[PDB]
Structure 1
């Protein structure tokens, strides 16, 4: 399967910076969502789940085709709760009907991270919508109730290595688990709509307790009111993972730099970019624009 990036006709940096600003302006406006967390965390989760279907072996799945717009992927049990990120973006797609679905879902994730004061993420245009029959089947996204060997093995399919996996998981400092979506409940920290390295700090400094929640699932709970998933706590159980966790709890700039590279790579897996294709765009935030 080859998927070649095709820039939307005649579009350039300024067009996509207009779509960025539209998403970012609505993130500021619709602030009440999920008890004032706002839409940013569900939008970086949506960009991860449309990319996380990729399989390196046959180049199926991935962010290129925008296939989450089809019922099979929209109704995947693993995507429960992401309909709220879709409905947030649907106004903006009506306003810029020329951007492809893959591009709009991935730029929403980029915009949310930078607007929640994360690192800049280089983003590239050119994903092309593909037919309903290209939609990957349910079951390619990871279970939460498993251990470190499962996480390592699952992420080899998206060929991410240990460092990349640990840098990507730092995004679980954002938002929260919702019992009616996943059977898990609670936030992982106090700053859950500002991008920081707090996931790593909480993992190493809190007093975790294995408890059973109302959906009868086990999760790691702390006195402070935070929770960690079994696959999250996995990172301090494995010796290779645990020493990268310590590296990111001791250096927030290295965390930001490595997250930026692994999230771009995540979003680009499966796509062939021609050598005459434009460079990756670095978008300015509303704040850097005085907007």
Structure 2
């Protein structure tokens, strides 16, 4: 059978596998592979020409509807980007993970296995020059362009993943197509981007399977908001997308489709949902279980969707696949659309509950009305929304590659300004270092502020980080965890240094507050190491700039607000999961391994950079001195631990003999002495001759985090 899992024996066991994913890159790609460099060698137009030709090259094993695969490719692209969540920046099209379980087998991705398979020859032809991730989005773009609508732009640069993202929690359900995340529409459990397990956003038949358009709109609005889209963008995307193609449900998928890819026979070679006698029979194609086209010309860009939806009355009915769908009352639309496969037959348009939701909901209705009255505005909004949808997880403008990248930078790219001055050199760096350390700022203050600046970075969607010094802007400047009042004091002192440095120059050289924050942190770490007798020189990369409020969507940064911060021993008093689980989730966003996280937390506790300057986990008699005291004292059996009475997050470390309170700590600190694997790391660092190693490892991790958003080396 299967070798089982510790997770099965102990469901509550800390999920360190997510951090192990950061210890190596699976797949056959060399260590020195530079995708950006490879994509630069690609003839994008040649790939687009091949995709254009593919659009009308029907393959017998999956005949193209209306002789054009374009709509199928748009759906593939929308589903690829559609899993994105702003909460943690996970999901999305950046790694092409629709190709792996569990996403490749979600019911909502039924038959996209065939869509991706149609693209295999092109992928093989261009090889490493174009990733599956980039290719899936490009196919969607070419499809839209080939059907009469010029796209807003396209950027390459999405490097392919070779496995699923183990850190994504898709929901609490134990079964696909079920929901245990909301009681009332618009009240979905926080952190989730969809209202049902296994679906992209919402149920096409309506909430809980009920054809209730009004209620459907509530979930549509909430899920799209959680995917960074407002009402106008949402309506533009749905209407633009459903302007093309059709839904498939010749019969009930529950009884007519074979196992999803992960459960299918080996001879299926990665495909799934085999149709019982007729996978090539387009006339009996089954995907969602809903049947019918939305418009009269499913392969042409026009106002057909908005017109059919708004200019006619619709009623809920039961389709041939047993699913809820809507049909028009009048016969003005009866057989007004050619059959997707039978040239001698016609079909009547249909609408989904989620489409009717756009007409019933007052706010959405207003948008659709305006679009209908102004087709130009409809196009403008759809083009920009499609570009946003497919590029929002790619990070800053520097990561957007290729000849089709728009000249206009969008706010959702969190753009950084150019430095209109000369960068400081080694001499200046050393001077600023001494000046910051000689200020009224302490080592703890400097470390805390540099961490506050860099710690917002998340590798999921490449947002956040120290470049830009957005820490000094809304909303970060007022986040509780950053201690607003304290932060102001530190920033003012650094700004004064910046001013004095800039005014003392006579050659055009200047320094940004962004660089001073990081440089101050580095100087403070070097100082703490020096206090312990170790001479360390942290590599410093000058060039960070200071971003302004005009180019910062403040509300969008709320998603980067930490609920738990291990370096600062901050635990929001409202979190549901155990603090250490959040700690691991956050560590993943910083691309840390379990060993790096351990060195970081342990080293940090010897410096003492806690929120509100508490002594939680500060197991040392000499604060601001980088040593392995945290581990030596944490592992000492002479101390016994227990939960603090009349407390929520505190534990007391008592002398096992006298009962004298020796230390105080939180679960963040104690997990390193409890979890089997973390304890093995702690034992290494807490050994007699491991101090120097811990110092070097702490410094290496500190430097790594400070540089996470510096793509000036990509």
Normalised TM-score (structure 1): 0.88
Flag structure 2 segments of 5+ consecutive residues without an equivalent: 1-33, 171-196, 207-215, 250-285, 334-347, 407-714
1:206–1:51 Cα change, 3 Å: same
Q: Among residues 102, 105, 115, which one is paired with 1:75 in the alignment?
A: 105
1:183 and 1:232 map into 2 onto residues whose CA distance is 16
Aligned match of 1:139: 198
Query: Would you say 1:169 and 2:200 are equivalent positions?
Result: no
2:321 and 2:125 map into 1 onto residues whose CA distance is 40
Classify the secondary structure of the residue corresponding to 2:152. Answer: coil
Aligned match of 2:138: 107
After superposition, residues 6-21 of structure 1 pair within 5 angstroms as 8-12=36-40, 15-21=43-49
Aligned match of 1:189: 295
1:240 and 1:276 map into 2 onto residues whose CA distance is 36
2:83 and 2:148 map into 1 onto residues whose CA distance is 27
1:219 and 1:10 map into 2 onto residues whose CA distance is 46
Q: Among residues 227, 234, 241, which one is paired with 2:350 in the alignment?
A: 227
1:17–1:248 Cα change, 3 Å: same
CA offsets 1:35-82 (integer angstroms, 9 cap, x no match): 424200010000000101111011111010111221322111110121
Classify the secondary structure of the residue corresponding to 1:123. Answer: coil
1:140 and 1:273 map into 2 onto residues whose CA distance is 29
Query: Would you say 1:216 and 2:244 are equivalent positions?
Result: no
Aligned match of 1:178: 248
After superposition, residues 1-291 of structure 1 pair within 5 angstroms as 8-12=36-40, 15-30=43-58, 33-98=63-128, 99-134=130-165, 137=170, 139-141=198-200, 142-146=202-206, 147-170=216-239, 171-179=241-249, 180-222=286-328, 223=331, 224=333, 225-273=348-396, 275=398, 277-278=400-401, 281=404
Moved more, 107-116 or 7-16: 7-16
1:276–1:201 Cα change, 3 Å: closer
Moved more, 139-148 or 223-232: 139-148
Classify the secondary structure of the residue corresponding to 1:227. Answer: coil
CA offsets 1:115-168 (integer angstroms, 9 cap, x no match): 111132301110011241316556351211221111101101111000000100
Q: Is the 8 A contact 1:155 1:165 kept in 2?
A: yes
Classify the secondary structure of the residue corresponding to 1:182. Answer: coil
Higher share in helix: 1
Q: Is the 8 A contact 2:359 2:368 kept in 1?
A: yes
- Distance apart, 1:243 and its partner CA: 1.0
Q: Is the 8 A contact 1:122 1:280 kept in 2?
A: no
Normalised TM-score (structure 2): 0.37
Moved more, 266-275 or 40-49: 266-275
Moved more, 157-166 or 69-78: 69-78
Classify the secondary structure of the residue corresponding to 1:211. Answer: strand
1:212–1:277 Cα change, 3 Å: closer
Q: Is the 8 A contact 1:110 1:121 kept in 2?
A: no
1:151 and 1:276 map into 2 onto residues whose CA distance is 30
2:400 and 2:393 map into 1 onto residues whose CA distance is 16
Classify the secondary structure of the residue corresponding to 1:9. Answer: helix
CA offsets 1:151-188 (integer angstroms, 9 cap, x no match): 10110111100000010012112111101211211111
Larger CA Rg, structure 1 vs 2:
2
1:268–1:54 Cα change, 3 Å: same
Classify the secondary structure of the residue corresponding to 1:220. Answer: strand
1:134 and 1:281 map into 2 onto residues whose CA distance is 29
Q: Is the 8 A contact 2:151 2:383 kept in 1?
A: yes
Classify the secondary structure of the residue corresponding to 1:96. Answer: helix
Q: Is the 8 A contact 2:157 2:399 kept in 1?
A: no
Classify the secondary structure of the residue corresponding to 1:181. Answer: coil
- Larger RCO (CA within 8 A; separation ≥ 6): 1
CA-atom RMSD in angstroms: 2.3
Paired positions, count: 279
2:229 and 2:141 map into 1 onto residues whose CA distance is 19
- Distance apart, 1:253 and its partner CA: 1.6
Classify the secondary structure of the residue corresponding to 1:132. Answer: coil
Q: Is the 8 A contact 1:63 1:269 kept in 2?
A: no
2:403 and 2:227 map into 1 onto residues whose CA distance is 21
1:228 and 1:270 map into 2 onto residues whose CA distance is 31
1:276 and 1:63 map into 2 onto residues whose CA distance is 15
